[PDB]
């Protein structure tokens, strides 16, 4: 289980706007996924931590799968599910609140 793509995918988005969108949300645990403008075709999980620091994690898409760290997921839904319910993304912190783009 994970929210639908329209609820958290922003397309190609630079880090500055990504952080602004998360700080407009303003809640620790807010997250989004974006295509990197600097490394096109690869993705980024952007996450607002309990310390009001946005953390950015690369997600590499290969063969219709997604890799973050050394971990393989078959869908972004499965990746979000894993870091929402199964494993901490940061020490003591999981994905909580999907942030949707102001435009779909």
């Amino acid at each position: 289980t994970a929210p639908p793509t329209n609820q958290w995918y922003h397309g190609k988005l630079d880090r500055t706007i990504a952080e602004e969108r998360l700080r407009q949300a303003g809640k620790s645990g807010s997250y989004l996924i974006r295509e990197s403008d600097r490394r096109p075709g690869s993705f980024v999980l952007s996450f607002l931590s309990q310390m009001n620091v946005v953390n950015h994690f690369r997600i590499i898409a290969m063969s219709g799968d997604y890799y973050i760290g050394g971990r393989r997921f078959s869908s972004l839904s499965d990746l979000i599910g894993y870091y929402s319910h199964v494993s901490s993304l940061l020490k003591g912190e999981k994905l909580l609140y999907p942030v949707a783009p102001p435009e779909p």
């Binding site: 971990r71 494993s87 901490s88 993304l89």
Partner: peptide, 12 residues
Amino acid sequence: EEENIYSVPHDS
């Protein structure tokens, strides 16, 4: 331009 720095999850 200098690239931004990315993090790795706690479990990796």
